[PDB]
């Protein structure tokens, strides 16, 4: 219920930092905030579209942080699994 707050904090912090890390790296596509936010979601949700990813060392770090913070933070699925387990 409140975890979902940390998720948006990360997804936004990740989105931002990611762009910072990647610009400068010739060939990097993670360089505009908007799509960087789309990347961050894909990452936490862990979904697998492989359409956007990092190439710099730092970028991969922001990546790792988003995976940890976000894959965990997505410990929000369960709350939605509880409410949907009760009122149904």
């Amino acid at each position: 219920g409140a975890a979902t707050v940390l998720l948006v904090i990360v997804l936004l912090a990740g989105s931002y930092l990611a762009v910072l890390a990647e610009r400068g790296a010739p060939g990097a596509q993670l360089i505009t905030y908007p799509r960087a936010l789309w990347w961050s979601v894909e990452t936490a949700t862990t979904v697998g579209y492989g359409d956007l990813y990092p190439v710099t060392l730092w970028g991969r770090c922001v990546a790792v942080v988003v995976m940890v913070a976000g894959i965990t933070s997505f410990g929000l699925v369960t709350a939605a699994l509880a409410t949907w387990f009760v009122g149904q």
Partner: antibody, heavy 118, light 108 residues
């Protein structure tokens, strides 16, 4: 009102350096990047580099000899481009432009004409 | 780095005629292409963003299309004020790059 203000011209003797300025107004976001573009007379637009004022990091075009060093002053909302050891090859109009972190140059400065001559 | 090819370098059209500027990317860049207009002694001005999105303040006359490697900037019924140099610019991959530009010439 003019979003990006740049001085009209700068005369520089060969070998010397000059610091160009770009004063920005209007909305400012932590996601703004200030770009610099060079254009020689009769020629096209060449990207020089970019800087993110909120963090202070700068990136440069790798394909060209590095003549510039970018900095930014948050309190005065001014971005600077230090060009050093110039030659006539460096004579051109230098534009500054603002990008909201979404890929396009929403607005451009009027440009500073730099002439390298004795 | 992505190379943007703008050919022909000069396009001659008669008044009121529709014109199309070409921009080809060396590799696929989705719709991450933007167009700028630069009149003699003027600074560049954004005309179209993300291949086909309108910019407020720009005449409806201007439109863009394409995706992938081939893009087009079109002007329906050209008029004198459209005389200028037109540049494309990509933001799909770092670093951003510019096309070499196409000049619009009107045969009156």
């Amino acid at each position: 009102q003019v979003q990006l203000q740049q001085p009209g011209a700068e005369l520089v003797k060969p070998g010397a350096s000059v610091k160009l300025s770009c004063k920005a107004s209007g909305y400012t976001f932590t996601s703004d990047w200030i770009h610099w573009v060079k254009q020689r007379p009769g020629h096209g637009l060449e990207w020089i580099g970019e800087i993110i004022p909120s963090y202070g990091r700068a990136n440069y075009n790798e394909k060209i000899q590095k003549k510039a060093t970018l900095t930014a002053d948050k309190s005065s909302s001014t971005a600077f481009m230090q060009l050093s050891s110039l030659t006539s090859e460096d004579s051109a109009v230098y534009y500054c432009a603002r990008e909201r972190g979404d890929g396009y140059f929403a607005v451009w400065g009027a440009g500073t004409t730099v002439t390298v001559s004795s | 780095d992505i190379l943007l090819t703008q050919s022909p370098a000069i396009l001659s059209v008669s008044p009121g005629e529709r014109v199309s500027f070409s921009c080809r990317a060396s590799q696929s860049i989705g719709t991450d292409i933007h167009w700028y207009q630069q009149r003699t002694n003027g600074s560049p001005r954004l005309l179209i963003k993300y291949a086909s999105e309108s910019i407020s303040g720009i005449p409806s006359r201007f439109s863009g299309s394409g995706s992938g490697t081939d893009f087009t900037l079109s002007i329906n019924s050209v008029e004198s004020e459209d005389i200028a140099n037109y540049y494309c610019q990509q933001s799909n991959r770092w670093p951003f790059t510019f096309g070499s530009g196409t000049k619009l010439e009107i045969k009156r």
